[PDB]
Ligand binder design. Structure first.
Ligand SMILES: Nc1ncnc2c1ncn2[C@@H]1O[C@H](CSCC[C@H](N)C(=O)O)[C@@H](O)[C@H]1O
Ligand SMILES: NC(=[NH2+])NCCC[C@H](N)C(=O)O
Ligand SMILES: O=S([O-])[O-]
Ligand SMILES: [Zn+2]
Ligand SMILES: [Zn+2]
Length: 264
């Protein structure tokens, strides 16, 4: 009946899905149910969806939340959402989710298009927010929940996990969308830590440039300074590890070491 509803709307509004903006519409009702459940949506919450699509998940958010802001790049979809839904509590915002100014919000419950998985996520992590539930292409969600010491551990993994408990909650097959995509998706929960770990971005970029290296060699080789600081390198914390083996905590030990020696 969500599948039936979808094909109803396709013909009705003569919709031509654009894969260039990742137009794969969700049509399994349980995935909406899970997302809502996981986000524990309530009558006080101000939600931020990206890419409302045919507005299925938006419709479910809107009837549970105080307010919903949703950011749609496709102006035609926006013309449809307005004519099909009667949302008293949804503000629709035309533009690129990455480019436009975000309004204030305490939870995210959205699909995240493939081509903005990385910018969106980094933008979200720079934000004050109580809970995110965001569906990603499966590789990217696997990267986000990679643990220190796996190959797919990277800057994203670190920067995410420094801010929140990051876990995959269900895996969603490609049969769950129309058009059918090339890849599976995952629903990811992000819970802000009380114990937030905040790290110098430039240092992280530096370390993770060649992340398969030792912390000392990675530092030696990442003078963004003065090369004449070999003295400090040998006493660097966590010198036995390689960068891809570091937790946010050990990265902070390295940061605080370099501040103490006025390298930052
Ligand atoms: N950069 C971007 N900013 C905002 N919306 C975007 C976008 N790139 C794609 N979109 C929109 O995001 C949606 C992704 S596919 C549809 C989402 C899915 N039906 C859902 O459960 O919400 C499409 O509506 C697409 O037009
Ligand atoms: N498998 C887990 N969910 N473990 C971590 C705790 C997450 C839990 N949903 C919370 O709200 O804190
Ligand atoms: O394909 S969008 O323009 O409805
Ligand atoms: Zn359920
Ligand atoms: Zn150590």
């Amino acid at each position: 009946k969500m599948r039936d509803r979808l094909f109803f709307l396709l013909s009705k509004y003569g919709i031509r899905p654009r894969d260039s903006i990742g137009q794969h519409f969700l049509i399994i009702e349980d995935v909406i149910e899970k997302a809502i459940e996981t986000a524990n949506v309530n009558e006080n919450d101000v939600i931020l969806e990206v890419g409302p699509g045919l507005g299925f998940l938006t419709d479910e958010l809107a009837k549970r939340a105080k307010k919903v802001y949703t950011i749609e790049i496709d102006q035609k979809i926006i013309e449809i959402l307005k004519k099909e839904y009667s949302w008293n509590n949804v503000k629709i915002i035309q533009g690129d989710a990455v480019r436009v100014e975000w309004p204030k919000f305490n939870k995210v419950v959205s699909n995240i298009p493939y081509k903005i998985s990385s910018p969106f996520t980094f933008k979200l992590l720079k934000t004050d927010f109580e809970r995110a539930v965001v569906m990603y292409q499966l590789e990217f969600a696997l990267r986000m929940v990679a643990k220190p010491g796996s190959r797919n551990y990277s800057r994203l993994s670190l920067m995410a996990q420094a801010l929140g408990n990051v876990e995959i909650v269900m895996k969603i097959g490609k049969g769950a969308f129309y058009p059918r995509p090339k890849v599976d998706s995952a629903l990811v929960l992000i819970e802000p830590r009380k114990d937030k770990i905040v790290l110098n971005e430039n240092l992280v970029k530096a370390l993770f440039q060649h992340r398969r290296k030792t912390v000392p060699r990675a530092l030696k080789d990442s003078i963004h300074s003065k090369d004449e600081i070999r003295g400090i390198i040998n006493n660097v914390p966590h010198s036995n590890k390689r960068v891809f083996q570091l937790y946010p905590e050990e990265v902070k030990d390295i940061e605080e070491y370099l501040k103490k020696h006025g390298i930052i």
